[PDB]
Amino acid sequence: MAEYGTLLQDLTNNITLEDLEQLKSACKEDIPSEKSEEITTGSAWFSFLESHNKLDKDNLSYIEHIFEISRRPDLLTMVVDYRTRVLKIS
């Protein structure tokens, strides 16, 4: 669970308010309009997403895509890499 916590945080370190806009732009259909509005922090979007069941402690597929579709593969990579490294660790 925790490592995932840093994972969200790692992309969050790389997340600019602007980066989020782009992810939101990608997410416009999936993440509700009302909510996308108030996404002024990387953690906020996770914490929203977490609050709704579009992201477990294990589940990433929702966000993985978002990072794929959005032209910001650093974050994707962190999700991908996390999935893997933690897989190899566990």
Side-chain angles (χ1 to χ4, degrees):
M1 300 180 181
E3 297 68 6
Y4 189 50
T6 306
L7 173 278
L8 287 54
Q9 161 165 63
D10 287 303
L11 68 79
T12 294
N13 294 303
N14 295 297
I15 279 291
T16 60
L17 187 287
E18 294 66 7
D19 289 299
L20 282 179
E21 284 285 301
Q22 183 175 297
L23 301 178
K24 299 299 75 289
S25 297
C27 302
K28 294 180 184 180
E29 297 185 297
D30 290 298
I31 193 292
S33 181
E34 180 187 6
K35 300 300 177 186
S36 181
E37 298 178 1
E38 58 181 359
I39 296 176
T40 178
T41 177
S43 304
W45 180 50
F46 296 118
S47 298
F48 169 64
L49 198 54
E50 297 178 299
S51 298
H52 300 206
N53 292 179
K54 306 309 299 180
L55 180 165
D56 295 299
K57 72 301 176 56
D58 290 57
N59 295 293
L60 54 64
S61 182
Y62 178 83
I63 74 172
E64 181 177 60
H65 176 70
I66 303 303
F67 307 118
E68 174 183 297
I69 59 180
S70 181
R71 294 300 188 299
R72 194 70 179 76
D74 300 7
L75 293 58
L76 184 74
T77 294
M78 295 291 64
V79 183
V80 174
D81 186 61
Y82 166 67
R83 158 280 188 177
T84 300
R85 62 172 65 189
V86 178
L87 182 295
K88 296 297 182 179
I89 288 178
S90 304

